[PDB]
């Protein structure tokens, strides 16, 4: 009774890469490095988007949101390293860069309910 395949875009292997142009300026999103969120993976941590502004490339891709997990960047693994290398590598170099990301199905990354009246 293993896992079954449904779609080629929405599955446990949810993965997508897109090349975007970045110039000397500020990004439209802010990434963050957290822990104890998705232990289903390996014994470490990954980088996930923390904010996005619709209309920007990171949103022009087609199906992007606040949570996309960045895997690589033009063939430059970041795993093992600490947020330090994450913010540094974020700088990049050339404009045209290939960024690897992953968009898992709804139910894997449940947002936490911060103090409030109801919501």
Curated annotation (Swiss-Prot):
**Subunit composition and interactions:** Interacts (via the first PDZ domain) with PLEKHA1 and PLEKHA2. Interacts (via the second PDZ domain) with TNFRSF6 (Fas receptor) (via C-terminus). Interacts (via the second PDZ domain) with TRIP6 (via the third LIM domain and C-terminus). Interacts (via the third PDZ domain) with NGFR (via C-terminal SVP motif) and PKN2 (via C-terminus). Interacts (via the second or fourth PDZ domains) with PDLIM4 (via C-terminus only or via combined C-terminus and LIM domain, but not LIM domain only). Found in a complex with PDLIM4 and TRIP6.
The cellular location(s) given in this protein's UniProt record come to: Cytoplasm, Cytoskeleton; Nucleus; Cell projection, Lamellipodium
Q: What's the protein here called?
A: Tyrosine-protein phosphatase non-receptor type 13
The function of this protein is: Tyrosine phosphatase which negatively regulates FAS-induced apoptosis and NGFR-mediated pro-apoptotic signaling. May regulate phosphoinositide 3-kinase (PI3K) signaling through dephosphorylation of PIK3R2.
Annotated family: Belongs to the protein-tyrosine phosphatase family. Non-receptor class subfamily.
Instruction: Please list the tissues where expression of this protein has been recorded.
Output: Expressed predominantly in kidney and, to a lesser extent, in lung, heart, brain and testis.
Entire-sequence positions represented here: 1475 to 1588 of 2453
Highest taxon above the source species: Eukaryota
- Residue ranges occupied by any PDZ domain in the UniProt entry: 17-105
Q: Identify the species of origin.
A: Mus musculus (Mouse)
């Amino acid at each position: 009774t293993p896992h079954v395949k449904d779609y080629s875009f929405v599955t446990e292997d949810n993965t997508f890469e897109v090349k975007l142009f970045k110039n000397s300026s500020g990004l439209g999103f802010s990434f963050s490095r957290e822990d104890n969120l998705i232990p289903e993976q390996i014994n470490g941590s990954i980088v996930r988007v923390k904010k996005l502004f619709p209309g920007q490339p990171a949103a022009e891709s087609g199906k992007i949101d606040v949570g996309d997990v960045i895997l690589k960047v033009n063939g430059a693994p970041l795993k093992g390293l600490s947020q330090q290398d994450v913010i540094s590598a974020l700088r990049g170099t050339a404009p045209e860069v290939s960024l690897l990301l992953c968009r898992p199905a709804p139910g894997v990354l449940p947002e936490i309910d911060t103090p409030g009246n109801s919501s």
